[PDB]
Short mmCIF file of C-alpha atoms and ligand atoms in Angstrom, two decimals:
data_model
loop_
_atom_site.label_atom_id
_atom_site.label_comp_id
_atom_site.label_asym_id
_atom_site.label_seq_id
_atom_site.Cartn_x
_atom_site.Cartn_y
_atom_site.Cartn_z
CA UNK P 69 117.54 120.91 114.41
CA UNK P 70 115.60 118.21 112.49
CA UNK P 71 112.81 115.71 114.18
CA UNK P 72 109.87 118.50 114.14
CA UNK P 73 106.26 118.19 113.20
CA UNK P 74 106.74 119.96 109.76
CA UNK P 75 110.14 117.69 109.34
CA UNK P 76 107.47 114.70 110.15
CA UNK P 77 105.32 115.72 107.48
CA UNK P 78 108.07 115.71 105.09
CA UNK P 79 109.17 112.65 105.84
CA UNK P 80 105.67 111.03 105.71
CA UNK P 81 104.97 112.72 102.18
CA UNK P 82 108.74 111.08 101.37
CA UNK P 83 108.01 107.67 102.06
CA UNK P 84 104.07 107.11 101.47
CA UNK P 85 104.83 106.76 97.93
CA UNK P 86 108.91 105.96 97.14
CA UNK P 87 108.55 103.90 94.32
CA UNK P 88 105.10 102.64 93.70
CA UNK P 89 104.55 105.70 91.90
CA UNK P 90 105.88 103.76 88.51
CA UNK P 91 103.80 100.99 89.15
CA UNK P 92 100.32 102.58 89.94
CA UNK P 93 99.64 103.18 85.84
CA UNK P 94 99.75 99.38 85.25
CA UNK P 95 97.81 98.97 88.11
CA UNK P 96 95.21 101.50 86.51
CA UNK P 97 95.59 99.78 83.22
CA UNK P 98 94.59 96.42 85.01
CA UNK P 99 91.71 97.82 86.59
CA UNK P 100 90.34 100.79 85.12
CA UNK P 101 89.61 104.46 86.15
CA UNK P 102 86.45 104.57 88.28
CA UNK P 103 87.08 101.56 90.32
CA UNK P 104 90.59 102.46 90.85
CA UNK P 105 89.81 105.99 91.87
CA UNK P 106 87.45 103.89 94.07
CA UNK P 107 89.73 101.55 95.86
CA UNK P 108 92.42 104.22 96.09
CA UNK P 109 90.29 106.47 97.99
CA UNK P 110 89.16 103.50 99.97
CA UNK P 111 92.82 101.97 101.00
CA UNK P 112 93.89 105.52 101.45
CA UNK P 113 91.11 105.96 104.20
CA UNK P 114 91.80 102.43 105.80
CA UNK P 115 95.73 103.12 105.50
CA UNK P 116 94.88 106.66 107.63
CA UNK P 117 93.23 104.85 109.88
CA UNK P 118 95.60 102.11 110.66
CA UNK P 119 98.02 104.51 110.86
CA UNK P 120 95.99 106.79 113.84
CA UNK P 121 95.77 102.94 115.62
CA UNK P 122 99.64 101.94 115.69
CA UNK P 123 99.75 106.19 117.04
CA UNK P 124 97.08 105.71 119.72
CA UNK P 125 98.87 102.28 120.81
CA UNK P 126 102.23 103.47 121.09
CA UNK P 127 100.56 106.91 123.20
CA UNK P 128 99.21 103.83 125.68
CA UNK P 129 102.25 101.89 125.60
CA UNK P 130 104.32 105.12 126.28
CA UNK P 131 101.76 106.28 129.05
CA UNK P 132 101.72 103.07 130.66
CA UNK P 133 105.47 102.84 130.83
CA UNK P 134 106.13 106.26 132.25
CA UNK P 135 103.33 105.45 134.71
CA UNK P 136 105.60 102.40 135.75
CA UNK P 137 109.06 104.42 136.09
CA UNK P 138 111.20 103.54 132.54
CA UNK P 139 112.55 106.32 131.05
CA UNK P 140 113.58 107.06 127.48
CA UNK P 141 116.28 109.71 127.36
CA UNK P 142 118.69 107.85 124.89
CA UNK P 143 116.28 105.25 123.99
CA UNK P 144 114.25 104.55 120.65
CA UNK P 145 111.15 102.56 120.66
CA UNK P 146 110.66 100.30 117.46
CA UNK P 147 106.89 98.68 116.81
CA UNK P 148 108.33 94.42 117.97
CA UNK P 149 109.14 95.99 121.67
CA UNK P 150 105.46 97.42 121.90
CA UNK P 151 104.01 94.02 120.23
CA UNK P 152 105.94 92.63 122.95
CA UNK P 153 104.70 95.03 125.56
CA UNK P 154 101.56 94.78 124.65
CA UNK P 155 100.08 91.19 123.73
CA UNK P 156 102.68 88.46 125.17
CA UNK P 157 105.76 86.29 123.64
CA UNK P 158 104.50 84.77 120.60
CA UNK P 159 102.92 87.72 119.55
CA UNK P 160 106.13 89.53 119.64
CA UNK P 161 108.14 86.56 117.85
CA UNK P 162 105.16 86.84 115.00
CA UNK P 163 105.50 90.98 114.87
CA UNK P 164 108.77 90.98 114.61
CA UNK P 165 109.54 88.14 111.77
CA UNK P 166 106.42 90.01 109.74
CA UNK P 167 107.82 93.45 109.71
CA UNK P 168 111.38 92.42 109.45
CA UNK P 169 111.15 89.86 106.53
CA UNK P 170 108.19 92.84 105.37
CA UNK P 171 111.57 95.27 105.62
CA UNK P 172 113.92 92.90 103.78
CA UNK P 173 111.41 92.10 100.69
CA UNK P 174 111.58 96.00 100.43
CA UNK P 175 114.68 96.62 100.19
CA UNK P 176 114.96 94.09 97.06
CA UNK P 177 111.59 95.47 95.61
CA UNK P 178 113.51 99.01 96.30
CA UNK P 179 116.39 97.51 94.55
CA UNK P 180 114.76 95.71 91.59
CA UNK P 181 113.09 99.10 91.13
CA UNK P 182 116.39 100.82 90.69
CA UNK P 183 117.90 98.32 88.73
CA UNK P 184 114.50 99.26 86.39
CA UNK P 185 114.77 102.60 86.34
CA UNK P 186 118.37 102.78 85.14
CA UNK P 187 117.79 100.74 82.65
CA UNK P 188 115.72 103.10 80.70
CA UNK P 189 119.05 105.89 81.07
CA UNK P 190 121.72 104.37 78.95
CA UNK P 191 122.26 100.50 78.59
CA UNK P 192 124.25 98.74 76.26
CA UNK P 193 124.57 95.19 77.77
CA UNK P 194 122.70 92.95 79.93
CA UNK P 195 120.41 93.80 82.69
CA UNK P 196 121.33 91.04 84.94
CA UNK P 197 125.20 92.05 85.14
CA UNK P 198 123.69 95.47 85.42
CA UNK P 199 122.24 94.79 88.94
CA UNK P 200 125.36 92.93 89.56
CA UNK P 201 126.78 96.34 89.57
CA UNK P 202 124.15 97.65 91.54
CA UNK P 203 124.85 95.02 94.11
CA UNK P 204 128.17 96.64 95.32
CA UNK P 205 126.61 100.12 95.37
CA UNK P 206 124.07 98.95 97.75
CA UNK P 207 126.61 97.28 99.99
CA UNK P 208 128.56 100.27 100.32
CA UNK P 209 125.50 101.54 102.72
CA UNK P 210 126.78 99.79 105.00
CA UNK P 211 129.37 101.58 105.91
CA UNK P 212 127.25 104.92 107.43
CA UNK P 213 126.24 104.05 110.90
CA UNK P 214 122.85 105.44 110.24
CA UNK P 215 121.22 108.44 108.37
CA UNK P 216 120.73 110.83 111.61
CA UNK P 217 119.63 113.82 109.71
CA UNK P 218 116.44 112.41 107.76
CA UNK P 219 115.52 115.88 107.02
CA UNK P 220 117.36 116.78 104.39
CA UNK P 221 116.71 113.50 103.22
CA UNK P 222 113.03 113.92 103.60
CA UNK P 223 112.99 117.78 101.91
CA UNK P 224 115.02 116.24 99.08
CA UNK P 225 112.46 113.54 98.33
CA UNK P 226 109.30 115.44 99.17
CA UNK P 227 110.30 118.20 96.37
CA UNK P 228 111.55 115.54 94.17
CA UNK P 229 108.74 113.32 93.79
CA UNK P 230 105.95 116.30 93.69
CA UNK P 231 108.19 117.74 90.74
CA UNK P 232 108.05 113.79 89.20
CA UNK P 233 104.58 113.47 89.88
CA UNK P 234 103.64 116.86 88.31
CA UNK P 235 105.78 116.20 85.10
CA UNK P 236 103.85 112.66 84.84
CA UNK P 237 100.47 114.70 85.07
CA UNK P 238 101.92 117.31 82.86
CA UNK P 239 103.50 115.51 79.74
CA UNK P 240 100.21 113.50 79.13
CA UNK P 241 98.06 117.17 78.65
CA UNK P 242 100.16 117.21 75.40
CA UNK P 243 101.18 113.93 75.26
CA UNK P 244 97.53 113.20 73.60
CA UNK P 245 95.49 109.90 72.96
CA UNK P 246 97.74 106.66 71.80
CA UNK P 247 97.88 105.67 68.34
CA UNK P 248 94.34 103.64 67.84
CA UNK P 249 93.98 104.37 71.99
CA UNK P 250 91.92 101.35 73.51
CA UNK P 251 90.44 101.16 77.22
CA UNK P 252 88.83 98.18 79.00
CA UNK P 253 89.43 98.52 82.43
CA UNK P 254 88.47 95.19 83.93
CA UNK P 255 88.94 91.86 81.64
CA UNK P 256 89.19 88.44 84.32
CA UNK P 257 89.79 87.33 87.53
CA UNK P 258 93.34 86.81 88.33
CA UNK P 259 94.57 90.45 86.21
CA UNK P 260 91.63 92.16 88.39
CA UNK P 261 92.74 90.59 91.56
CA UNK P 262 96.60 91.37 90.97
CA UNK P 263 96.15 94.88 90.76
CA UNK P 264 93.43 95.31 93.38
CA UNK P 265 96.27 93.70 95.82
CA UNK P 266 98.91 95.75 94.13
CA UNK P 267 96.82 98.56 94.80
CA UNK P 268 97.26 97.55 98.76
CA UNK P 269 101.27 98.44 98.60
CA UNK P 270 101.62 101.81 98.58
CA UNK P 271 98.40 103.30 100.97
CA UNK P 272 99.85 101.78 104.12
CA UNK P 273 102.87 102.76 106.28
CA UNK P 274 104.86 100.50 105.15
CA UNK P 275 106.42 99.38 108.63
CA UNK P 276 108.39 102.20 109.34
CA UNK P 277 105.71 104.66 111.13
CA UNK P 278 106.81 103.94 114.77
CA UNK P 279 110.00 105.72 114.84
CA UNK P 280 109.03 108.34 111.82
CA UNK P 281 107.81 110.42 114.97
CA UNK P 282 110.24 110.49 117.40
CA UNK P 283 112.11 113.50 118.97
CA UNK P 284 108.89 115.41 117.94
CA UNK P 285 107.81 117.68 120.91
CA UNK P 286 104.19 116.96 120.87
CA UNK P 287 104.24 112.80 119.87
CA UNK P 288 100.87 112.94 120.53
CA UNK P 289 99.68 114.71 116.92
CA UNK P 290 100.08 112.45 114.34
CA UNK P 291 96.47 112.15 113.23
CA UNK P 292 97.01 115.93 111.61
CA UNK P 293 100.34 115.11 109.95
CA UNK P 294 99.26 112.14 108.51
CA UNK P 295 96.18 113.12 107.26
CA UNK P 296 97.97 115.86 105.36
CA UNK P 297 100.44 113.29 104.05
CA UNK P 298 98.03 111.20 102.75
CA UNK P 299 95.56 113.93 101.29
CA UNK P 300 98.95 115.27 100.03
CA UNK P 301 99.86 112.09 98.28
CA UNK P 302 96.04 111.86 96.70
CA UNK P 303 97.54 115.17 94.71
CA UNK P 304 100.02 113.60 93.74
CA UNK P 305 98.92 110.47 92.68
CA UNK P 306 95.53 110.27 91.25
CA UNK P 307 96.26 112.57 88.52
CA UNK P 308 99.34 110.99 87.54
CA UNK P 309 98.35 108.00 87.47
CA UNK P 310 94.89 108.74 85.56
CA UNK P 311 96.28 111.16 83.06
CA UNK P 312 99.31 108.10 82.24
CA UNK P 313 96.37 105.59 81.92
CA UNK P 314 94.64 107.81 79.91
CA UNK P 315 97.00 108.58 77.50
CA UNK P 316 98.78 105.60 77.07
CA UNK P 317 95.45 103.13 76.68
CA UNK P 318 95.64 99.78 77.16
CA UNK P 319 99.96 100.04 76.67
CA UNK P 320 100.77 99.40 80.20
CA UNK P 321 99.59 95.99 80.66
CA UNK P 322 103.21 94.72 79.43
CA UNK P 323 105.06 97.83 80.15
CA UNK P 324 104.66 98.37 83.97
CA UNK P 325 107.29 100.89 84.25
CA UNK P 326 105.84 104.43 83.22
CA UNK P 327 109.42 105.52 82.11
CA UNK P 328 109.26 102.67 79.48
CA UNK P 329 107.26 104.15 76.99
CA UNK P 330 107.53 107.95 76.88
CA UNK P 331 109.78 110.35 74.98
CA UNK P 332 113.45 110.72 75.73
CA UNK P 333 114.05 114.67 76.51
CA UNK P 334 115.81 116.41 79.49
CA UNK P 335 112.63 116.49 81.99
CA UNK P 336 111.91 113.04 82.34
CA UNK P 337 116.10 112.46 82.53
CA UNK P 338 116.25 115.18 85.43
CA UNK P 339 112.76 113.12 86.60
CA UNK P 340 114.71 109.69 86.19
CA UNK P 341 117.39 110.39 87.92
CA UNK P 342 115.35 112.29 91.03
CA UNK P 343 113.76 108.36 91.28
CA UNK P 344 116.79 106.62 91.69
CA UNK P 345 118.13 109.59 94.43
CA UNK P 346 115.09 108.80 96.08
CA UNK P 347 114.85 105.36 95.66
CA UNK P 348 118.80 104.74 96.86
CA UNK P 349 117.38 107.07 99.81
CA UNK P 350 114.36 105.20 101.10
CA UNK P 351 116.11 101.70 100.38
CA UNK P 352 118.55 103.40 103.28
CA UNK P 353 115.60 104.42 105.19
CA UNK P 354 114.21 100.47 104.90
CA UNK P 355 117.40 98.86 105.46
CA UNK P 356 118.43 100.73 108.67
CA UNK P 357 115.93 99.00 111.35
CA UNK P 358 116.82 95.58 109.39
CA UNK P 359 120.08 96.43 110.27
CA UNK P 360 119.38 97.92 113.61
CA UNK P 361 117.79 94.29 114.67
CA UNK P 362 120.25 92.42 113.14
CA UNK P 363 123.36 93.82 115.33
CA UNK P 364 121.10 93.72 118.57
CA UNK P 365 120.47 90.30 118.09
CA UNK P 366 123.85 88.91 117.11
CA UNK P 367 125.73 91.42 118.84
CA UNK P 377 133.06 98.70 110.87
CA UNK P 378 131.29 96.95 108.13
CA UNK P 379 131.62 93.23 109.05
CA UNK P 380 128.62 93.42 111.38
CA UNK P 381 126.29 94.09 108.66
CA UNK P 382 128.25 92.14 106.01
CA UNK P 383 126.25 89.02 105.90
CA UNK P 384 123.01 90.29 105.93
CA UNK P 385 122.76 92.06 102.59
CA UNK P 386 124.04 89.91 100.50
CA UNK P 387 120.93 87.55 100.83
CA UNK P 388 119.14 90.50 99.70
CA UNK P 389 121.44 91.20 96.44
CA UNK P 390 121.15 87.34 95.33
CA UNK P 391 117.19 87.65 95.54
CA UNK P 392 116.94 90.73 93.50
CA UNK P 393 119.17 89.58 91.01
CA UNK P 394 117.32 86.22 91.03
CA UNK P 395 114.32 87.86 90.14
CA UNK P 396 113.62 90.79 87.89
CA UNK P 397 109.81 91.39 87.83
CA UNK P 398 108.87 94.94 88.91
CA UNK P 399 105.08 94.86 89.27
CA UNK P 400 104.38 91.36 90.65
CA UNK P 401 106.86 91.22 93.14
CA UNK P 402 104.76 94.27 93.98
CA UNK P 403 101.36 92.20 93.81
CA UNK P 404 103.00 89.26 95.28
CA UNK P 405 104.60 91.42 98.53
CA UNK P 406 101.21 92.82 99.00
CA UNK P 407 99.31 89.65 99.14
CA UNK P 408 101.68 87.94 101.17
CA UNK P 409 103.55 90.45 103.94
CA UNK P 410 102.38 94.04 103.27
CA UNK P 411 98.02 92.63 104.14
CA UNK P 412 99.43 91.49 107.30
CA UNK P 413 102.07 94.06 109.40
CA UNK P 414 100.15 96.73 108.45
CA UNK P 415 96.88 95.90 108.51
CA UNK P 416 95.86 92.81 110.52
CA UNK P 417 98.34 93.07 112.99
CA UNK P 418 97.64 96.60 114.24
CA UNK P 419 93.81 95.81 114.28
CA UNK P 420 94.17 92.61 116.61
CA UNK P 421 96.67 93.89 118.73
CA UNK P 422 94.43 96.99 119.38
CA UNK P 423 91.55 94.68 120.48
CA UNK P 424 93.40 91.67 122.25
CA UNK P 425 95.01 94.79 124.17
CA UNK P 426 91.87 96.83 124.57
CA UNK P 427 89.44 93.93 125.41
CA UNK P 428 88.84 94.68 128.76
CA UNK P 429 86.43 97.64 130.01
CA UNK P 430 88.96 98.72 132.61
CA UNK P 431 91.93 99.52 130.15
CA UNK P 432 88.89 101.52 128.14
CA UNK P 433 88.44 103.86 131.12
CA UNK P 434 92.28 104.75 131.45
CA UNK P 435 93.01 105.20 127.54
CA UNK P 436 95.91 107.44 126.66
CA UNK P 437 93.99 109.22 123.97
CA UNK P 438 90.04 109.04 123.11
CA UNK P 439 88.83 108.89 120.18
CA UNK P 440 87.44 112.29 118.58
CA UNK P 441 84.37 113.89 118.21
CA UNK P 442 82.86 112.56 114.95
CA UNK P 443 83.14 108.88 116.39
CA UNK P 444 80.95 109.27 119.48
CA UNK P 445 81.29 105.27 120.21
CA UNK P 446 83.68 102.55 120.74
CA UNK P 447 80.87 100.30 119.17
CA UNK P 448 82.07 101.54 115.61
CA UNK P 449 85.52 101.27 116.73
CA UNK P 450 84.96 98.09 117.24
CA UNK P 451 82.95 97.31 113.55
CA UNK P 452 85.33 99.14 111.93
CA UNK P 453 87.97 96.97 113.00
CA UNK P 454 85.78 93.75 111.89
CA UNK P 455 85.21 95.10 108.59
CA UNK P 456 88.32 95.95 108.07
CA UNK P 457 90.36 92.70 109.37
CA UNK P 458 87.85 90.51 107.57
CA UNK P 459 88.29 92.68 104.15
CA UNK P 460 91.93 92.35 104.22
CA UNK P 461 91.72 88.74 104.87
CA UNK P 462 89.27 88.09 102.65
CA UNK P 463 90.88 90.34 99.05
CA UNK P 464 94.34 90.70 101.01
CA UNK P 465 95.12 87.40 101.88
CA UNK P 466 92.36 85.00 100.99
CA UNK P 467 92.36 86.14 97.29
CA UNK P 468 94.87 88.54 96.55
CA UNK P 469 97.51 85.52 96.87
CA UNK P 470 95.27 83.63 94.72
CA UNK P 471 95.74 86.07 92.13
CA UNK P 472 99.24 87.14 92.54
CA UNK P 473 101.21 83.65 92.89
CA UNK P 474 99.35 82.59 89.59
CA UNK P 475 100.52 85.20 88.18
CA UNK P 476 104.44 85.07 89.50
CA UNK P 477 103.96 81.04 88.23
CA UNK P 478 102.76 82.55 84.84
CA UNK P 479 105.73 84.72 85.02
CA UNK P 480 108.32 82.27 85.35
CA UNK P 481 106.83 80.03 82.59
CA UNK P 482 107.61 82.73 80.76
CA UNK P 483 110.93 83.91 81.60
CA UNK P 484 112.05 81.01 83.97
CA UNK P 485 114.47 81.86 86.40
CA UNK P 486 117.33 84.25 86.68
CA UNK P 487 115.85 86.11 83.68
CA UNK P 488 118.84 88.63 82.45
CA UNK P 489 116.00 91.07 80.94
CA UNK P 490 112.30 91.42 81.58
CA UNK P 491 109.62 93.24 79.90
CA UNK P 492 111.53 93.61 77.22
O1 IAC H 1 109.40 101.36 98.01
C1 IAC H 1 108.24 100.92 98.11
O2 IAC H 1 107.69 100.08 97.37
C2 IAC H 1 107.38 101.43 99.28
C3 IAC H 1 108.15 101.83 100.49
C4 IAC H 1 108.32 103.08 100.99
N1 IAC H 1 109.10 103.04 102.12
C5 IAC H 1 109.45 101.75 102.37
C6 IAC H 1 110.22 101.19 103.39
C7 IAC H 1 110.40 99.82 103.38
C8 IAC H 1 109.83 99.02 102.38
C9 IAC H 1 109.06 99.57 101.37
C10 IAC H 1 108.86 100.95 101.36
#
């Protein structure tokens, strides 16, 4: 039986990082290797602690509703009904279009990335018709009520993406320096900005946090297993990405996808096809609340018919792998993960007399709700300020920049 604490880990370490893994070179490339070790470490911290805050408020919301009389025995609590439970109406209306259009622009970033990565495999006509062809596969999800055993799922993608992750490390030991190898980290303003928001994507929780804990026996912990899941993807990651950057020199400023440039041998077709397993998995994983919300609202496929296919039209419409990235995290990603969490916490929290019954207080090594409460400034005022404020500055110059380029309904890109 699946749902424990280790099968939480798992699943945590699965989804961190599903697909932003290709992207994080070019993001290196676009911003060098001291101030992206930098800001890593820094978002990784933040994303921890946003993710301890959405915890702690669902412990109070669950505390406070068991104190009332509601019970839960064949009930599942997403993050819109604690919103709701929490703040008021409008709060909940703004929660739940954010995560759910959040949830929808994944699944076609989860898509596009597919698409991508197959095209690197074997390809002998054009990409667009390609992710025509991708559209029906990605229909046919529809069709599984729901993926109820998520730990196999979540084994599968853990030991997939270390292996993919330790092969992108590896091959670059050998790999050596590029021909005529040149490095210059940070050039202007808009490149800087677009990966510093890009950065943003993947050290989050990407929405789906509420329920990856439920049916676990102690609900409570999740400070331990996501601590481990982050520090776990920092293994992964940093040296992957830094060794790629390395190696490959200023090369990845056209060619975002990492699979793009290497060599063609069996190990990076066993690690190209563990991707795209892991990225049809997680697009599952996204799609299923979408769908979840969609069939509670309106009311054994035709339920869920209508919905993706505004999902296949905008991934086909649009090809870009790395600024959709930049673009998602400047727009959506800096605001249900981020802001949202930290000004529900304090418009719920305000009061003195909710401070004396919390659920959960905070540990030792924070002896005050004063830095609680700075914390939360700094952080809300950072994200608005490089997540918002700038980051879209940045990122919707460059998607303009793009289509100049390439227009609209580009059949191939970066190519
Ligand atoms: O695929 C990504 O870019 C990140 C990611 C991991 N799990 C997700 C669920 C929904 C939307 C995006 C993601």
């Amino acid at each position: 039986h699946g749902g424990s604490v280790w099968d939480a880990w798992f699943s945590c370490a699965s989804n961190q990082v599903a697909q932003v893994l290709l992207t994080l070179p070019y993001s290196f490339s676009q911003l060098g290797m001291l101030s992206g070790i930098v800001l890593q470490i820094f978002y990784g911290l933040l994303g921890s602690w946003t993710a301890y805050l959405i915890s702690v408020l669902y412990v109070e919301y669950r505390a406070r509703k068991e104190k009332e009389g509601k019970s839960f025995k064949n009930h599942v609590i997403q993050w819109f009904e604690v919103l709701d439970g929490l703040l008021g109406s409008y709060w909940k209306a703004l929660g739940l279009a954010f995560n759910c259009t959040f949830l929808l622009f994944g699944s076609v970033i989860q898509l596009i990335a597919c698409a991508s990565n197959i095209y690197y495999i074997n390809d002998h006509l054009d990409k667009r018709t390609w992710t025509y062809i991708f559209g029906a596969c990605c229909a046919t999800t529809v069709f599984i009520p729901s993926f109820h055993n998520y730990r196999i799922w979540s084994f599968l993608g853990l030991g997939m993406t270390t292996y993919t992750a330790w092969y992108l490390a590896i091959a670059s030991i050998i790999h050596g320096q590029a021909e005529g190898v040149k490095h210059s980290g940070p050039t202007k303003l808009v490149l800087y900005f677009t990966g510093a928001t890009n950065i943003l994507y993947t050290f989050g929780g990407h929405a789906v946090t509420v329920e990856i804990m439920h049916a676990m026996w102690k609900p409570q912990k999740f400070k331990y297993i996501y601590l481990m899941a982050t520090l776990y993807v920092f293994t992964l990651t940093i040296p992957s990405a830094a060794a790629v950057y390395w190696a490959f020199g200023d090369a990845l400023l056209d060619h975002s996808n990492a699979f793009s440039l290497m060599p063609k041998n069996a190990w990076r077709d066993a690690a190209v096809i563990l991707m795209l397993i892991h990225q049809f998995i997680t697009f599952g994983f996204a799609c299923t609340p979408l769908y979840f919300v969609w069939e509670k609202v309106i009311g054994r496929a035709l339920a869920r018919l209508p919905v993706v296919i505004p999902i296949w039209f905008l991934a086909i419409i649009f090809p870009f792998f790395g600024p959709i990235n930049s673009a998602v995290g400047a727009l959506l990603v800096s605001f249900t993960v981020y802001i949202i969490p930290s000004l529900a916490h304090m418009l719920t929290y305000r009061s003195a007399s909710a401070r004396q019954n919390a659920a959960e207080k905070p540990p030792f090594f924070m002896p005050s709700w004063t830095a609680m409460y700075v914390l939360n400034a700094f952080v809300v005022v950072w994200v608005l300020i490089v997540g918002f404020g700038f980051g879209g500055w940045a990122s919707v110059t460059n998607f303009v920049r793009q289509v100049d380029t390439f227009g609209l309904f580009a059949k191939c890109y970066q190519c």
